[PDB]
Design a protein around this ligand. Structure first.
Ligand code: A1I5H
Ligand code: A1I5H
Ligand code: LYS
Ligand code: LYS
Lengths: 457, 457
């Protein structure tokens, strides 16, 4: 209803020569800065402050109101009669609503609560909607969420702190951030249905990237020692609590190191992120518990660990007829089956931060064959607080193998021949990694994927 | 031809038990690091180095070869007979081609040129393609370009240095980088044909963002004091030397400042970028000239400056029948005409860094009406070295005006009602800006748009 009462006070401010949306009011300080510089008498420090009025208490010849700056800091104001204007007091009473941004120049004082008492005051913006929420309305209107709910404020700022931490971490180690195409003639470097968009300029279809690996790899051919890219990827698939079709994603590549190297870094990275952004490696969680991610983290092998949990020897050689069987007696091909069985037994048991290494050849086209063990590739996954957080490879640089690997993939015939060309100019040995920002945050906080981004749907 | 000779030496290395693409060779130092620590005698510093062999000179019982690290630094190697192996020398002669990555452990020495003389040596990767180029092949194969052409190396690293400079600059001033949706239900915050992609998850079409403004604005409602976002946008339109359909783009928003504020920053920003990434504000250019971007930069008004150059008074009031006329006598509506005429007269004259401010209402739906002058909006553009580099607004926060502005835009009817909702919760006065990374680099270097990105097409 009050929609209309608000719109009325707007135009009755316009016509009256009052500006309800001024170009520029002279704020001298953020409320934070007033607080930070003032730990029942009066002081002669004068400031201009601005602030949302998120609490009124109009009372005759004095109105007391609370101002909340964007970040949520608060300073009370006391709009008075004798300090300037009787039209002042009336206009204040008349024209101020709740969720109204308000500039207030004057002196800052101790009260019976730190307030500021006005010489000047002026409306900086007029709300045409009061402040009130289901969680699928918080996401629809993050801009109100951010006003009403502190935790929204804190989470948004966390994601940001975390992303900066990552950049600090990588940069300190000599990593260089790069930009690779989002629109590509064919999308690759991962396994998912791409998004297709039609180009006017070319009259061909183009695909949004599912991942930067293939282009990041061209860079390593190029002479990049150490590279990464933090940026959205697009997977044209369903959404669940760990999956969304557009999400932010880290990738990383270092020359002259293997998956054993890239797992040391990933741990240090993650822990360094905890330190900067959170201040503890003893992570408090919604239920009140604490997940420790400090010290050293356990590595297991996929086949061995799967073997122990099944009570029988599973290997690269174990046939699919055998695996299908074991699979049934709990409830396509080999690689899928190994990972499936592993995840469904060992995977779901895990608590503490855990790496799992030495993976089925079938389901790892891009990662080098293992240096000693036949049948497996030098890939790891990291399961942190029971979430598939991150992946690392010793990267396959043999073009003929890589060609072979791809052709078989297609057989259930257009291959990325430029990718393959690049490799046959010579890619030095490198370990890549991959990590998801939403899950990084989930794994650290227990927040849902839908709370870790500013604007989902 | 040598394609096949190469592929042969690969499999004849495999079968022979030699690994042509090893998982991990123990590099102890980058060539840079060897150089940096060694300004015709011998020294007992031992290292393992890796490097592309970009020059052979095989000669009996000594081969001299040059190794080029990814960044382009060079150390010569001297594969010998007596220092280890006679099969060594032969295998070296036999199996080494050009564009081959090669690990060489041994002692570092002064020669008659700083080389390294080997105990061990081993092929790190085998090329199946020699090193050779038109400019529309350099772009098709940036990974070779980066190997062969220094300037490619330098440019790639420049773009990177520049992007870091921006982040430093903004962060120092207290800006917070944010991530807003690339996929949106309707795309806005600029004027261009969007890219449409179909979603499986929802069975609706979605549009890649043409710009982040509208979502960045929701953030300011949200309580963000100071925000920005450096990231690709997508405009489904033609390519020219200043326009590409996917490009990287900065946007910026500060509360409690106007377009006069955001132009001070933009200048300081740009100049600070020059200092960090280039080391001079006296910019050397291809023709050998120098563009000075130091000191203070000139502001002009659009109508006034257009008036002087036409020799007659043009204003908001000047009719379209008049403008069409002037337009003819050189060779839709008012706003378009003003900007058109301005660009075609004053625009093309400009040399020195120049701001142009106070713009036609029609062609600036999102920027506030000017605080005193009727008919114009408080928007500026920055023309640097004759290129439309950047834009700044005092941002329109009046929702009813903003609603009005939009409806008229549609009339040549679906409006972004959530955008409009956000504004009617109250957006404090803020100045936004917008800047293009490719043009930033063009404007600084004289490089084409197609050289400023890693991977175009
Ligand atoms: C929301 O996160 C994701 N959404 C989709 N739709 N797909 C993936 C993620 C995610 O975090 N992924 C990573 C998992 C660890 C590594 O394999 C890197 C990718 C895949
Ligand atoms: C390659 O750069 C661009 N490509 C397209 N297709 N459109 C634009 C640019 C660019 O740099 N733009 C900016 C110009 C200054 C400001 O108005 C911000 C946008 C628009
Ligand atoms: N492309 C991988 C991430 C990088 C892995 C290392 N090569 C993925 O989408 O999971
Ligand atoms: N959306 C603008 C850039 C930001 C201008 C300030 N609001 C553009 O695409 O040019």
């Amino acid at each position: 209803e009050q929609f209309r009462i608000r719109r009325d006070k707007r135009a009755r401010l316009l016509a009256q020569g009052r500006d309800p949306y001024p170009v520029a009011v002279p704020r001298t300080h953020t409320l934070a800065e007033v607080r930070a510089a003032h730990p029942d008498t009066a002081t002669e420090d004068i400031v201009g402050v601005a602030g949302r009025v998120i609490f009124a208490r109009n009372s005759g010849k004095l109105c007391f109101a609370t101002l909340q700056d964007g970040d949520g800091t608060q300073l009370q104001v006391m709009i008075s009669l004798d300090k300037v204007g009787q039209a002042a007091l009336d206009a204040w009473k008349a024209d101020v609503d709740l969720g109204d941004i308000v500039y207030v120049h004057g002196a800052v004082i101790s009260s019976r609560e730190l307030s500021v008492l006005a010489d000047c005051w002026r409306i900086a913006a007029k709300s045409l909607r009061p402040l009130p929420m289901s969680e699928e309305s918080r996401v629809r209107q993050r801009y109100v969420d951010l006003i009403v709910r502190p935790e929204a404020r804190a989470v948004a700022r966390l994601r940001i702190a975390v992303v900066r931490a990552i950049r600090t971490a990588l940069q300190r180690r000599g990593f260089l951030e790069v930009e690779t195409p989002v629109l590509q003639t064919l999308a690759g470097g991962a396994a998912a249905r791409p998004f297709a968009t039609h180009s006017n300029a070319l009259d061909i279809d183009l695909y949004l990237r599912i991942a930067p690996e293939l282009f990041l790899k061209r860079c390593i051919v190029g002479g990049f020692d150490k590279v990464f890219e933090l940026n959205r990827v697009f997977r044209n698939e369903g959404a669940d609590s760990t999956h969304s079709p557009e999400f932010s994603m880290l990738e990383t590549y270092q020359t002259y190191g293997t998956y054993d190297d890239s797992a040391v870094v990933t741990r240090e990275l993650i822990q360094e992120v905890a330190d900067e952004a959170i201040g503890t490696r003893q992570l408090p969680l919604p239920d009140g518990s604490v997940y420790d991610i400090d010290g050293e983290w356990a590595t297991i092998q996929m086949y061995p660990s799967l073997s122990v949990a099944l009570g029988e020897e599973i290997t690269p050689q174990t046939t699919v007829d055998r695996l299908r069987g074991i699979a049934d007696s709990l409830g396509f091909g080999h690689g899928k089956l190994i990972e499936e069985l592993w995840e469904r037994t060992v995977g779901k048991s895990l608590s503490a931060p855990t790496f799992v290494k030495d993976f089925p050849v079938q389901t790892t086209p891009l990662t080098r064959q293992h240096r000693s063990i036949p049948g497996v590739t030098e890939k790891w996954d990291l399961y942190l607080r029971g979430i598939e957080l991150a992946t690392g490879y010793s990267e396959l640089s043999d073009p003929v193998v890589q060609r072979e690997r791809f052709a078989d993939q297609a057989r259930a015939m257009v291959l990325d021949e430029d990718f393959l060309a690049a490799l046959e100019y010579g890619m030095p040995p490198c370990t890549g990694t991959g990590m998801g920002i939403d899950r990084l945050l989930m794994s650290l906080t227990g927040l849902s994927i839908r709370e870790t981004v500013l604007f989902p749907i």
